[PDB]
Design a protein around this ligand. Structure first.
Ligand SMILES: */C(=C\C(=O)OCC)[C@H](C[C@@H]1CCNC1=O)NC(=O)[C@H](CC(C)C)NC(=O)[C@@H](NC(=O)[C@H](C)NC(=O)c1cc(C)on1)C(C)C
Ligand SMILES: */C(=C\C(=O)OCC)[C@H](C[C@@H]1CCNC1=O)NC(=O)[C@H](CC(C)C)NC(=O)[C@@H](NC(=O)[C@H](C)NC(=O)c1cc(C)on1)C(C)C
Lengths: 309, 304
C-alpha cells in the first residue's frame, strides 16, 4: 500500500509546535523557549555563564535575577517577562501576552522505548524535525548543536499536542539527555557539566516486533514461520543479541497489530527468533537490511493507516 | 563534541498552512493554496473510465469553475477561474491565503534532497526527508488519497516547492512533477505500464555522509590509500554507483577542508568499503552506506 520503498521514519507535522518556539536570553546566554498561553518554559541553565556550568547553585543564581534579567523574543518582537519561578530543571517565565498560537496541549512523561518528534531549534527558530525514541538507558540519539537547548519533543494525540521532552545536554558518548515539561530529567542525569555516563543500552524489542508487523502489513512476509515460542525461550535467545527482555505487557501493547494481521505475538517472536539466529541471508525487510527499533506499535498504525492531524 | 546525526526534514508548518482539499466528480485529493491560487494534480478530473488513455484537454474543456470544490477545513473556497499547466491545474479562488509564506517554485536535480508533507483530504499526516533518486523516482511512503502532497526545502523564511505527488510505479516507487506541472522522469499521468530507468547510488551523498561520520568523531573506515578520479569510478560503477565528476569533488571542498581529509583519499576509503564491506561495523549507526544526505545537508546539520 505505502510502496515497496520501506518504512519512512515519519515525524508529526510540526506546525503547531513551531508556533510555540521563542528565544530566551539571560545576559549573554541565549537558548530556546516554549511559549504556551502566558508562560515561557526553558532550561534553567539559561541563567548560567561560561564557568557556572560545572556545578551551578541554581537557587542562588536565580536570586540574583529579576524579571528584567530575561529577554524573550518571538520573531522580532520582545515579550515582556512579568514573573519567574523555577520548577525542577526548568524556568517558568510569566509573560504579559498569551501566545495566540497556543494549541490544545498537555504535558506527558514518556516511557522507555516510546518515540516522539523532535523540533530542533536555534535562536528561537525551528531548524529541522526528526523522529527519536527514548532509549532503554533513558537517553535519546538526537542531532543537536550548541544553542539547541530548549528544543522540544512531542507527539500529537488526535487534536492535542503532547509535549514530552525538552533538551538540556549531551553525554560523552554523543547521545542526549533532557527532561519532561515538569523539569524532571529522564534517567539519572543532572544538569551540570560533571562526569556523567549513559548506561549500556539495549535494542527495543517491542519496537522491532512492531516493525515486523508493519512489514507484514506492507506485504513483506517471507520471514514468517509455522512455529511459536514461549516468552522465556524467546528472551533467552534475544538477550544474547542484547535485546530488551520482552514482557507480557509488551505482548499486550502489540495486541492491535496482532489483531490486524492475525499473527499472535509469540508467533512473531518465533519469526524474530529465527531472524536473530540465522540472519536475513541477504534478503531485506521493508527495504532494510537491519531490524529497526525506533518505530512503536503506534507509529506503525499511524503510517500504515494514514492518520491525519 | 559530536552533534549526532538524523535524517531530518524541514519544519512543515509553513506548508501545512497551505494544504487544502480539492474535489471534482467523486475524486478528492490535496491542493496547495498560495495567495489566490490552488495547485493540484490534473488527474482529479478523471473518472474511472478515463484512467487509461485520458485526454486532459478534452476532459477539462467539459468542466466549469463550479465543477471544482475546494475546501480549507470546513470552509468552501469559491473557484473563480481554472487553467491547466502541464500536469497540474491552477484554480483561482475568491479569497487569498493569509498563511502563504514567502515561496518560489524550483525544479530540483536528481540526488538533491527535500522534505515531503504527506497529506490526506487536505490534512497533514506526517513529514519526512528523502532524496530525488538518480532515475527521478522517489522512494516515498504514500497511500491512495495522497496526491497533491508536496515536497519542499526551506531556506530561512522562504519555502522552495519542488514536488507534487501524482503516482506510484509498478515497482512500488513514486513519481511526480515540479510546481509547473512537469514530471520528473519519463512518466505520464495515466494508468499504463511504465518503468523507471535503472537507478544508482548517489555517490556524492555517500561521500558527504562519510565526512559527516568523521566530523562526528568516527574514522575507522579511513585508510592510507588514495586513488585517481578515474580509478575510483572504475570500481564504483561496478557497484551501481553514480560516476563521480570533478564538479562533485569541488562540491566536497568545504567538508574536505574542515576535516583535513582529501576528497580523493575519502574516495579511497569508500573504494575499500565497497570492495570489503563493513565487516559487521556501523557508520553513524548505519550498517549500509547512506545516500540521502547531500554535502549541503551535512554542513547544515553538523555545523549550522
Ligand atoms: C544546550 C545549551 C545551550 O543551548 O546553551 C545556549 C547558550 C547544550 C546541548 C549540547 C550542545 C552540544 N550538543 C548538545 O546536545 N547543553 C549544554 O551545553 C549542557 C549545559 C549544562 C549546564 C547541563 N552541557 C553539556 O551538554 C555538556 N555535557 C557534559 O558536560 C556532560 C555531562 N559530561 C561530559 O561530557 C563528560 C566527559 C567526561 C570525560 O566526563 N563527563 C557538553 C560537553 C556541552
Ligand atoms: C494519488 C491520487 C489520490 O490521492 O486520489 C484519491 C482519490 C495516487 C497515489 C498512489 C496510490 C497508491 N500509491 C500512490 O502513490 N495516484 C494515482 O492513483 C495515479 C493516478 C493516475 C491517473 C496518474 N495512479 C497510479 O499511481 C497507479 N499507477 C499506475 O497505474 C502505473 C503507472 N502502472 C501500473 O502500475 C501498471 C500498469 C500495468 C499495465 O501494469 N502495472 C496506481 C497503481 C494506483
Amino acid at each position: 500500500p505505502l510502496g515497496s520503498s520501506g518504512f519512512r521514519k515519519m515525524a508529526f507535522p510540526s506546525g503547531k509546535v513551531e508556533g510555540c518556539m521563542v528565544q530566551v536570553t539571560c545576559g549573554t546566554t541565549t537558548l530556546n523557549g516554549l511559549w504556551l498561553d502566558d508562560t515561557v518554559y526553558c532550561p534553567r541553565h539559561v541563567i548560567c555563564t561560561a564557568e557556572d556550568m560545572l556545578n551551578p547553585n541554581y537557587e542562588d543564581l536565580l536570586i540574583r535575577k529579576s524579571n528584567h534579567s530575561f529577554l524573550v523574543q518571538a520573531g522580532n518582537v520582545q515579550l515582556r517577562v512579568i514573573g519567574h519561578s523555577m520548577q525542577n530543571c526548568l524556568l517558568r517565565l510569566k509573560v504579559d501576552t498569551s501566545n495566540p498560537k497556543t494549541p490544545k496541549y498537555k504535558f506527558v512523561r514518556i516511557q522507555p522505548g516510546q518515540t516522539f518528534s523532535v523540533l530542533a531549534c536555534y535562536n528561537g527558530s525551528p531548524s529541522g524535525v526528526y523522529q527519536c525514541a527514548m532509549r532503554p538507558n533513558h537517553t535519546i540519539k538526537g542531532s543537536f548543536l550548541n544553542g539547541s537547548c530548549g528544543s522540544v519533543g512531542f507527539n500529537i494525540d488526535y487534536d492535542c499536542v503532547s509535549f514530552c521532552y525538552m533538551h538540556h545536554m549531551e553525554l560523552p558518548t554523543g547521545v542526549h539527555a533532557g527532561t519532561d515539561l515538569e523539569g524532571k530529567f529522564y534517567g539519572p542525569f543532572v544538569d551540570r557539566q560533571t562526569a556523567q555516563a549513559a548506561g549500556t543500552d539495549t535494542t527495543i524489542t517491542l519496537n522491532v516486533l512492531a516493525w515486523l508487523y508493519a512489514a507484514v502489513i506492507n506485504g513483506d512476509r517471507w520471514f514468517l514461520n509455522r512455529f511459536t515460542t514461549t516468552l522465556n525461550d524467546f528472551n533467552l535467545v534475544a538477550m544474547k543479541y542484547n535485546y530488551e527482555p520482552l514482557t507480557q505487557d509488551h505482548v499486550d501493547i502489540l495486541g492491535p497489530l496482532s489483531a490486524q494481521t492475525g499473527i499472535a505475538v509469540l508467533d512473531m517472536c518465533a519469526a524474530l527468533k529465527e531472524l536473530l539466529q540465522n540472519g536475513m541471508n541477504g534478503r531485506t525487510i521493508l527495504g532494510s537490511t537491519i531490524l529497526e527499533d525506533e518505530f512503536t506499535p503506534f507509529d506503525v498504525v499511524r503510517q500504515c493507516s494514514g492518520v491525519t492531524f
